Design a protein around this ligand. Sequence first.
Ligand SMILES: [Cl-]
Ligand SMILES: [Cl-]
Ligand code: NA
Length: 130
Amino acid sequence: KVFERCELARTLKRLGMDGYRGISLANWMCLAKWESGYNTRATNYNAGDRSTDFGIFQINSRYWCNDGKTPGAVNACHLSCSALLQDNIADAVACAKRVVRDPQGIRAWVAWRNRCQNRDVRQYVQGCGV
Ligand SMILES: [Cl-]
Ligand SMILES: [Cl-]
Ligand code: NA
């Protein structure tokens, strides 16, 4: 599923993402925008280390979900990576919450540092009623 901007904003708020571990909703929106373009079925194989990024938040198989083919991988979200390719983003949000519960927080995603950190991210939630 490819979410429309405001549709996703309202959905994440309902799932309790606004202010989770100090992270505002607009930051989550900025992250989803740059990671997958709000696309739940986006997949990206990282040839360099044999891992794959899955779904709307592009969560990595080396630490967060199990796809069975990633060398030396753990499954912290205790989910099959398939769960992060569904149209319903409930499991993906629960896993994103687990990621930021680690010391790095939102910084775990390099794309956030490049495109969201220290930026005016208000544009991502403007006019959405959230
Ligand atoms: Cl699962
Ligand atoms: Cl599994
Ligand atoms: Na894994």
